[PDB]
Design a protein around this ligand. Sequence first.
Ligand code: CYK
Ligand code: ZN
Ligand code: ZN
Length: 250
Amino acid sequence: MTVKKLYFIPAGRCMLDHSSVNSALTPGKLLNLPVWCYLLETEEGPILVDTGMPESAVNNEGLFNGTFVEGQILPKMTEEDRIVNILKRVGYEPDDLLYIISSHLHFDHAGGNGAFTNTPIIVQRTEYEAALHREEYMKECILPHLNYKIIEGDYEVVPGVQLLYTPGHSPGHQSLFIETEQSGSVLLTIDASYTKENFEDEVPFAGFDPELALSSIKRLKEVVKKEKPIIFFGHDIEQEKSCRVFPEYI
Ligand SMILES: CCCCCC(=O)N[C@@H](CCS)C(=O)O
Ligand SMILES: [Zn+2]
Ligand SMILES: [Zn+2]
């Protein structure tokens, strides 16, 4: 086996229109949503899940001016939220990590990937291929010479750390099913559901293929029925109220 510690580590924030968390809502109210990374302390070494936002977002809420998402996505990132600075404060440098796991290559999950030039970065083949051409991918999230460990489908990273292929929000989105010493089974949906209501109630939210995202939610509900994990959503302002966060762990 089990992971020794699972840390939730705030990595900045992002404003998103509320129509991105519930596709039925009337656009025009932004929500200041959390961006997370996760650090797993395992017998084999530390594994980082996602890497925050790119340096171009630092003190630059207008990063997406002049793009298809102008006014709809505004990163809220300071110098402290750079993943190398986060990791140094927690006690690590990039080359200390055993693996990086990219849930997907959207900007607030892979914007720090370039900091890791030796650590294998585990990413789904269908996400890597999408990032090579789809417009919602920033160049910082698909740098060409990193040590990618491309995978296809479900995958065991080390004992206690399983990747569940959950496409739809993005073409190769993957969620995590972790077994921890303190808590037992934990499901990190990541962006397979931004919020509890996207998951439980199947409220539609932003995604590349909403129908496929719904089938991935149904698949995760089969896993939930079998494993009864505690479940954490990708950008849920209500749940963030009660999350244990670094230096606490689960
Ligand atoms: C196609 C679905 C969305 C692409 C735009 C995008 O990168 N949105 C963010 C939301 C940050 S609060 C994400 O998915 O993590
Ligand atoms: Zn995403
Ligand atoms: Zn996200």
